Amino acid sequence: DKEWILQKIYEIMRLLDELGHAEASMRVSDLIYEFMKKGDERLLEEAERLLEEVE
Amino acid sequence: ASVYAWNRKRISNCVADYSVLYNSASFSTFKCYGVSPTKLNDLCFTNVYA
């Protein structure tokens, strides 16, 4: 499951760059770094929430 | 039980082995929020309610 979560967060920041919202992308990237060091899956929920605010 | 009037089972004063349910292939989904799903056998809770 962790592998899919990392892929989803990665795709979210990639999209945020494409959408022209670099600050949101930067914030999501930070979620990736923290995620790769932890078992905390709520970082996905934050990546998704940030994307929803942008879209 | 129905979703409107759900049941609550009290889990207390025991060993809670979560490896059976974690490894079981009979379940379609699992998600933990405040805890890591792989640390459940290291953790201890005041009481557990199912």
UniProtKB/Swiss-Prot annotation, chain B:
Q: What is this protein called?
A: Spike protein S1
Task: Tell me the impact of changing residue 24 to L.
Answer: In strain: Omicron/BA.1
Oligomeric state and interaction partners are given as: Binds to host ACE2. RBD also interacts with the N-linked glycan on 'Asn-90' of ACE2. Cleavage of S generates a polybasic C-terminal sequence on S1 that binds to host Neuropilin-1 (NRP1) and Neuropilin-2 (NRP2) receptors. Interacts with host integrin alpha-5/beta-1 (ITGA5:ITGB1) and with ACE2 in complex with integrin alpha-5/beta-1 (ITGA5:ITGB1). May interact via cytoplasmic c-terminus with M protein. May interact (via N-terminus) with host bilirubin and biliverdin, thereby preventing antibody binding to the SARS-CoV-2 spike NTD via an allosteric mechanism.
Q: Which domain of life is it from?
A: Viruses
Main function: Attaches the virion to the cell membrane by interacting with host receptor, initiating the infection. The major receptor is host ACE2. When S2/S2' has been cleaved, binding to the receptor triggers direct fusion at the cell membrane. When S2/S2' has not been cleaved, binding to the receptor results in internalization of the virus by endocytosis using host TFRC and GRM2 and leading to fusion of the virion membrane with the host endosomal membrane. Alternatively, may use NRP1/NRP2 and integrin as entry receptors.
Q: Which residues of the full protein are shown?
A: 348 to 397 of 1273
